[PDB]
């Protein structure tokens, strides 16, 4: 997973569970949730992006 | 009094003892065959007790005392 890859969310408590969002930037600082995923569909609080781990993402489109 | 004519007699639930009634309400809640204000029973227990054998007030009192003692047993 790196910038541009479309990913499906595997987090049950996420608003975008089983939804495809684009990776914005991956942090190489060794933090727990480094991947920033951005969504075309906003959540209830008014937020369209979130930090996920790599273990709760499934790549569905390699970046072109 | 109701088992003699269960079509033209209204079953009675119990008696009224509201001291706040005027005599116009004491008269209104007193039927033809009663000497006190009463409530007309609409629970159907008269029909049920008449269909299962109960014929007298002594039968009803015996059943009530049995159920009092059965509640004590429970």
């Amino acid at each position: 997973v790196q910038r541009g890859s479309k990913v499906r969310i595997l987090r049950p408590e996420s608003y975008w569970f089983r939804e495809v969002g684009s990776v914005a930037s991956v942090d190489q600082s060794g933090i727990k949730y480094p991947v920033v995923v951005r969504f075309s569909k906003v959540n209830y609080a008014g937020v369209n992006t979130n930090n996920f781990s790599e273990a709760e993402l499934v790549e569905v489109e390699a970046p072109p | 009094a109701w088992i003699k004519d269960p079509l033209n007699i209204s079953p009675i639930a119990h008696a009224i003892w509201d001291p706040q009634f005027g005599p116009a309400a004491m008269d209104a809640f007193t039927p033809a065959g009663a000497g006190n204000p009463v409530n007309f029973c609409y629970s159907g227990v008269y029909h049920w007790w008449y269909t299962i054998g109960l014929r007298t007030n002594g039968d009803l009192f015996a059943g009530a005392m049995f159920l009092l003692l059965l509640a004590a047993v429970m």
Partner: protein, 97 residues
């Protein structure tokens, strides 16, 4: 093609970096060897508040700045859209509150 100049008193320097129309300044700043404060990258905090000295940015996705606070020049550099270039202040979260 746009040119954004980030000014920071701490670093005491004005480095310019071109940013694409459809691209966040902070996101474009990461792909140009430049460090900036950022926490949520969603427009729901004030960690990347950059006062606008001149120019105009497209921050329609931002959802935290106040009407009177956005008139001062503050603009979340995390969910901002570089329309041109001009210049913008960095690390201005202490001036917000």
């Amino acid at each position: 093609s746009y040119k954004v100049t980030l000014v920071n008193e701490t670093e005491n320097l004005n480095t310019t970096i071109e940013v694409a129309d459809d691209e966040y300044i902070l996101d474009a700043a990461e792909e140009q060897g430049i460090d900036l404060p950022y926490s949520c990258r969603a427009g729901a905090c004030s960690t990347c508040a950059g006062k606008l000295t001149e120019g105009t940015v497209d921050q329609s996705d931002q959802s935290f700045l106040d009407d009177d606070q956005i008139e001062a020049g503050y603009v979340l550099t995390c969910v901002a859209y570089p329309t041109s270039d001009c210049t913008v202040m960095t690390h201005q979260e202490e001036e917000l509150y």
